[PDB]
């Protein structure tokens, strides 16, 4: 099903899956991470795109988060890939910084962003607790994870993504 296929992107506005472009809205804008030498100790922070900022989360006791600063982020903006250490080790399942990547056919990997020198800024994106504060949707594409904006994000708003139902229960949501 196009719904479940890695090769396809999805247009929020149209509900269309496509390979290159939505026929109505054109190709999606992927925002690049900033350049940082591989393995840099502050790699995850320094990889942050211009216009955003890592600062304490607005969620109580949630540590750091990612805020939008420069200007309105439109719907359908794409971020990623989520970087980290790829592994099947199940202690990665518990870092709290891992996304499951489905390789299809009851087999999977983890991309673990726990190590800041290996991860990118997306490790700092916190979990939405309600659909009203969620402005990012995580999804798998080309065997990797990306976040796309599912509403307009104004300056001064925290970016917030949904972690999946299992981790959400763990967070008390």
């Amino acid at each position: 099903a196009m719904s479940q296929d890695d090769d396809y992107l999805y247009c929020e506005k149209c509900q269309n899956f496509f390979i290159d472009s939505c026929p109505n809205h054109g190709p999606p804008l992927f925002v690049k991470d900033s350049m940082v030498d591989r393995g840099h100790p502050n790699h995850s922070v320094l990889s942050l795109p211009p216009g955003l900022r890592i600062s304490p989360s607005g969620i109580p006791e949630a540590g750091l988060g990612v805020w939008n600063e420069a200007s309105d982020l439109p719907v359908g903006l794409h971020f990623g890939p989520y970087e980290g250490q790829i592994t099947e080790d199940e202690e990665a399942a518990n870092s709290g910084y891992s996304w499951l990547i489905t390789k299809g056919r009851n087999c999977y990997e983890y991309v673990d962003g726990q190590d800041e020198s290996q991860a990118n800024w997306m490790r700092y994106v916190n979990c939405a607790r309600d659909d009203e504060e969620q402005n990012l949707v995580a999804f798998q594409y080309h065997r990797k994870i990306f976040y796309r904006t599912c509403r307009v994000i104004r300056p001064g708003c925290e970016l917030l993504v949904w972690y999946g139902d299992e981790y959400g229960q763990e967070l008390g949501i």
Binding site: S98, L100, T102, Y110, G164, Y167
Partner: peptide
């Protein structure tokens, strides 16, 4: 169980 998962 702190594993982020897609739909």
């Amino acid at each position: 169980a702190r594993t982020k998962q897609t739909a």
